[PDB]
Design a protein around this ligand. Sequence first.
Ligand SMILES: N[C@@H](Cc1cc(Cl)c(Cl)c(-c2cncc(O)c2)c1)C(=O)O
Ligand SMILES: N[C@@H](Cc1cc(Cl)c(Cl)c(-c2cncc(O)c2)c1)C(=O)O
Lengths: 258, 258
Amino acid sequence: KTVVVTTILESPYVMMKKNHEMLEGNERYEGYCVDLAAEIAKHCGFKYKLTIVGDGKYGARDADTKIWNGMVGELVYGKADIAIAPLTITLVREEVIDFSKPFMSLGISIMIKKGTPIESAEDLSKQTEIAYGTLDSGSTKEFFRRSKIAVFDKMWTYMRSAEPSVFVRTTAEGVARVRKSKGKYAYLLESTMNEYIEQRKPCDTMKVGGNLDSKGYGIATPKGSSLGNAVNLAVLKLNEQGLLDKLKNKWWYDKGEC
Amino acid sequence: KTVVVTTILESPYVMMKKNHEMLEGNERYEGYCVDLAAEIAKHCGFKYKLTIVGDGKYGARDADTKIWNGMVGELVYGKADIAIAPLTITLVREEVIDFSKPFMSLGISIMIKKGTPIESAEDLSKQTEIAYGTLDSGSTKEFFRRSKIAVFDKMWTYMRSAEPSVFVRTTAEGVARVRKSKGKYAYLLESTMNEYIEQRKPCDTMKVGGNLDSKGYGIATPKGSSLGNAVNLAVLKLNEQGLLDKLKNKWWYDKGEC
Ligand SMILES: N[C@@H](Cc1cc(Cl)c(Cl)c(-c2cncc(O)c2)c1)C(=O)O
Ligand SMILES: N[C@@H](Cc1cc(Cl)c(Cl)c(-c2cncc(O)c2)c1)C(=O)O
């Protein structure tokens, strides 16, 4: 009867509280998705347990084995009842799991060190003095790898061939690289995270230009799950009440350092 | 086998071509949703017929009879197979029909005549010199009627009690009222339409301030419809290809007069 929620550590969606080892259960964690899970459970009247996805992935199908990894996999194979995380609704994932309507919108976007003479994706695409890259795996890299749009295809060809490697292993490494490269590195990541980092010390990064795509994060459940229909209605209610808007203001701008 | 599509005449989503009476069938119409329907049918491989919703409504349940009107009603009662229109995904509609993930995002927003000293919803709420209103029926009026948010509740109390009536029967009447009122009337409508009108002659209106809410338009089908699953995957594909973005650019800014 206790709902098994899979999620992932990713600021400010889910983080461990600084004093977590003194605490127990769901109270160990805080963040946008922590609050969102509590609001959903409250409205739906169920008990739940926050668990962290074992492989630290969002969800992709291995070409060789055809096995789904990440939170998507935990749902497909019945290891969890629901995923609450900044998990993008995509065509390939929609075919294997159910998604709520989006609880938050986003797009791929450009992060620069303040002063970097870049304003758009097209700008980056037409030069090489300012190196630019993204995560060495995951959805943004796949977006570029697969894009048939001229500018993005040019950007991909550059990134894959650029030396030294313009890719990084983690978002922290990416942001650290922006900050240390003296304007000579720009970073591609989701607008939500870009905006969050813009409001934190040392206040030396900025989101520039329009988003490169448009998509949403959804709550995910195994295909045909009865819990899925209910949680989707809950997300629609919370949105219509303005609670989702308050939640973003809480975690993005209220706790704003810049 | 021919899919019955219900839709509604609403610029620039669906309009009759200036020479329509010389034409036949789907070719009579043009617009964002006309192109979107063609792109969906092409990908899904079905034939379809565009029909216009008989009562000219989007979809609401009559409190007395409990009967659904508009496009939602045509789906609920089996008069149409699918609705393709700027139809908002809402909690009450989601309970009675299926919706794709959103094909376009929007929010309620403020339209002013250029020069009108208003920048936000809060601005309007704290004064009465500049009258403000909305459609005399439909979703925006219902949004204000039902809102528990302080500023919007204040705005509703003002609108319902303001004399002369700040409400209008049609969007054209609303926009005409903005243009003729010499800065003494402001209008509340969906951001999509606000942005469209901003780019058309006489270029004397402007969208100001952030949106008041956040929501999406979805393709709708009867609950449990097998066509529904397929079209949803199609919408996700078109989005991921950038085709939805091209479609908005086509109808909003490419044909831009301002
Ligand atoms: N939405 C993604 C997972 C994800 C979440 C978040 Cl919050 C961020 Cl910020 C990113 C990211 C994307 N590009 C560069 C980066 O450093 C991080 C990726 C999915 O569903 O696969
Ligand atoms: N999305 C709505 C229908 C609808 C569509 C559009 Cl494109 C516009 Cl612009 C409006 C509108 C809202 N407020 C003032 C106005 O003049 C028009 C309403 C629904 O699903 O009920």
